[PDB]
Amino acid sequence: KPHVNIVFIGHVDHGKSTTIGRLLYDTGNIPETIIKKFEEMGEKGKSFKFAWVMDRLKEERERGIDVAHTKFETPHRYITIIDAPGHRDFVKNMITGASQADAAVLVVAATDGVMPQTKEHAFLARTLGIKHIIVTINKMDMVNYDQKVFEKVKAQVEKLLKTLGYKDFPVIPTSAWNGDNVVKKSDKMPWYNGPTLIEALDQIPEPEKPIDKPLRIPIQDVYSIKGVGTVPVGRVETGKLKVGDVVIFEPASTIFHKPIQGEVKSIEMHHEPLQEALPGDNIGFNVRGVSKNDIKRGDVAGHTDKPPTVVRTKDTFKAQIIVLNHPTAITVGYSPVLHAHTAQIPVRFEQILAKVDPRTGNIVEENPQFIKTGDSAIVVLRPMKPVVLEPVKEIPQLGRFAIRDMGMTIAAGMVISIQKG
Amino acid sequence: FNLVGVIRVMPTDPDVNLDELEEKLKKVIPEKYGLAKVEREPIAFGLVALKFYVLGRDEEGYSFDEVAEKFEEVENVESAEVETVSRI
């Protein structure tokens, strides 16, 4: 009954895709057309069949015969899965692009264990505001189903996730290729008594839409519609928008030194009128008394009592980043482009306060001379044009960012705090 | 291919010919990308988005963001934004 959105993460050779494949195959969620067409080949052995079937599923997807999601039902939930791109350039698309994941599955191979990548996958899970993790220690066959390897990799995977504020999460020894503990309970690991993966998915807590939080709607586009008037289009991220509400747009209002605000007359989602819009609804809405020229992409709507927080050029904010890639080294004065929600603005690195240990979360060097690829750090940034951002502990949806420069994704970040200057 | 990226294309106006626009957008996807399908998704007040399921590769040199820029140059396009990216 409840819908949960899950994102699979991990090193792209550690089996996460195969894990998703195994979930569909062993729950019987393969198209009948594929299964019948395989039967024409006669006996090929179990392994050949699973590989052939997953290859046939990929081809159907690519031909447009669900393309971008894997979907299946469990006893207590509808599950939608995303298999996350591993190449670091797509991180901006993850941070800025579509829906809230409710849970992450981080798949880590028993063989290689924790990789240089893995801390990035963890940090990314937090940055996206994902409440629940499930850990999978995969390829247990390649290490002879051994408990003492599972426990090591579990322990070190636990430090990365613990440092980020995850705890009491499942850690499941699996083999995706053979099936162990994905949907079928293993016989090879009697030492393990926790849930199988599909059991863990079923037990993800039902999501609470952030309706208690201040209204925030980042604006994607802005139209003048003949006979109705000014129509912003955006997704409500937090709070609720009801017909008749007054909303204000930032940083429009700060930039123009006046309220760019007015009354909400109607709301549409999928071309149907709504009386109220909730977190996750992608809506057009008619706001009276606001010019189409006074609002654009990257402005954010808010109620007048709790308006969106603007960080001006005169201000700065503190952030926690992971440096994903940089050809030399980041230093004070570095001036890349920050992308958050629907905004993008030039930013200035004003200070580098600390280098952080992603294994413990502790300051390892105050005031470093620079940072580079793979460093975790605490920086102070100054927007070179105003922007809406929120501290991540108040409004996580508007507290996440990506840094872009020279064509590539440099850093991902979280907004710790904002200092008015 | 091993990556699908959903790119959401908004029209400049509710009266844009979406059959004409689809056809034009299809011609500017670069050769090394593919296309699984195009869906139409109504938004509000007669605006209908085109959602392109672009096929690519999970590697340096591939970017659905660059496909979206090619799309933003086409006549009657207001915006093109990458929604979902996911392996297949």
Side-chain angles (χ1 to χ4, degrees), chain A residues 309-319 338 345-351 353 379-387 389-391 401 415-421:
Chain A
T309 310
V310 175
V311 188
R312 312 174 279 252
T313 59
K314 311 208 160 143
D315 307 322
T316 67
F317 63 95
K318 187 195 315 103
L338 178 153
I345 47 131
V347 291
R348 273 274 322 288
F349 282 59
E350 297 286 291
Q351 320 169 43
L353 300 172
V379 301
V380 182
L381 301 174
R382 177 182 294 290
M384 291 296 91
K385 289 160 146 223
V387 65
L389 297 167
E390 304 290 359
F401 67 88
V415 174
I416 298 324
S417 70
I418 288 158
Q419 305 82 45
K420 295 193 170 304

Side-chain angles (χ1 to χ4, degrees), chain A residues 58 83 92-93 221 223 271, chain B residues 1 11 41 43 65 79 87:
Chain A
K58 170 155 136 36
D83 190 4
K92 138 137 189 309
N93 289 159
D221 286 292
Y223 290 94
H271 217 351
Chain B
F1 299 124
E41 202 203 351
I43 314 297
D65 273 16
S79 59
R87 301 186 70 102

Side-chain angles (χ1 to χ4, degrees), chain A residues 177-243:
Chain A
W177 280 106
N178 296 325
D180 301 279
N181 289 324
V182 179
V183 13
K184 300 176 202 295
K185 180 71 213 292
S186 199
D187 34 49
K188 313 284 160 26
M189 295 173 284
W191 57 255
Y192 181 70
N193 310 323
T196 66
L197 174 54
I198 200 178
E199 261 165 1
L201 299 178
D202 194 47
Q203 295 159 19
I204 296 158
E206 174 177 8
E208 283 104 85
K209 286 162 173 181
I211 55 163
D212 58 317
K213 278 172 186 152
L215 172 56
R216 295 285 190 282
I217 318 171
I219 305 307
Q220 290 160 179
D221 286 292
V222 167
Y223 290 94
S224 205
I225 306 271
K226 3 211 82 205
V228 341
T230 299
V231 174
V233 172
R235 198 171 68 212
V236 176
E237 287 291 338
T238 60
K240 326 166 57 263
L241 179 61
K242 298 170 197 175
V243 177

Side-chain angles (χ1 to χ4, degrees), chain A residues 219 246-263 287-312 386-388 420:
Chain A
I219 305 307
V246 175
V247 304
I248 186 165
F249 298 80
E250 286 291 19
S253 298
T254 311
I255 293 165
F256 288 123
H257 329 289
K258 59 200 211 166
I260 307 304
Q261 71 174 45
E263 193 202 3
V287 187
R288 211 81 189 119
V290 177
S291 176
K292 192 208 125 29
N293 303 141
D294 288 352
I295 60 179
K296 50 177 187 178
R297 175 166 187 93
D299 280 317
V300 184
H303 287 133
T304 60
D305 54 282
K306 265 286 183 280
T309 310
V310 175
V311 188
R312 312 174 279 252
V387 65
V388 173
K420 295 193 170 304

Side-chain angles (χ1 to χ4, degrees), chain A residues 38-227:
Chain A
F38 181 77
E39 199 180 7
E40 286 176 36
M41 300 183 79
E43 182 67 71
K44 299 286 192 157
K46 286 117 164 199
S47 283
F48 185 106
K49 179 186 190 177
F50 173 63
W52 190 92
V53 162
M54 289 345 293
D55 184 79
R56 225 58 32 213
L57 193 96
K58 170 155 136 36
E59 281 155 21
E60 296 217 326
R61 286 173 166 199
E62 298 165 84
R63 287 198 288 282
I65 284 161
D66 298 329
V67 184
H69 295 94
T70 296
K71 287 170 149 169
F72 61 89
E73 176 161 333
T74 204
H76 301 87
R77 274 127 182 78
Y78 291 104
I79 295 151
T80 295
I81 292 168
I82 283 293
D83 190 4
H87 186 77
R88 299 176 167 74
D89 288 324
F90 302 100
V91 175
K92 138 137 189 309
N93 289 159
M94 293 196 282
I95 290 167
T96 255
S99 351
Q100 191 60 68
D102 298 296
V105 180
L106 160 78
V107 177
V108 176
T111 46
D112 299 39
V114 171
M115 301 293 288
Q117 283 69 20
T118 312
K119 92 270 255 160
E120 291 174 11
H121 294 132
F123 184 81
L124 185 262
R126 182 47 70 200
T127 297
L128 300 173
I130 300 171
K131 70 203 146 75
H132 191 22
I133 295 275
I134 291 154
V135 175
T136 241
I137 279 88
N138 186 45
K139 306 183 171 175
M140 284 309 291
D141 57 301
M142 306 301 205
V143 75
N144 225 81
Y145 304 90
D146 183 344
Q147 187 165 12
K148 280 83 204 84
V149 291
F150 167 66
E151 233 85 52
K152 271 192 163 185
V153 178
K154 163 169 162 147
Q156 43 170 221
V157 170
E158 273 174 330
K159 280 164 203 125
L160 290 168
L161 301 165
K162 170 54 166 180
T163 288
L164 273 351
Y166 290 112
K167 57 204 185 67
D168 313 314
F169 45 80
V171 193
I172 311 166
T174 78
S175 183
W177 280 106
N178 296 325
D180 301 279
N181 289 324
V182 179
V183 13
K184 300 176 202 295
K185 180 71 213 292
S186 199
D187 34 49
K188 313 284 160 26
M189 295 173 284
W191 57 255
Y192 181 70
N193 310 323
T196 66
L197 174 54
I198 200 178
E199 261 165 1
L201 299 178
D202 194 47
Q203 295 159 19
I204 296 158
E206 174 177 8
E208 283 104 85
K209 286 162 173 181
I211 55 163
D212 58 317
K213 278 172 186 152
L215 172 56
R216 295 285 190 282
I217 318 171
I219 305 307
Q220 290 160 179
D221 286 292
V222 167
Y223 290 94
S224 205
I225 306 271
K226 3 211 82 205

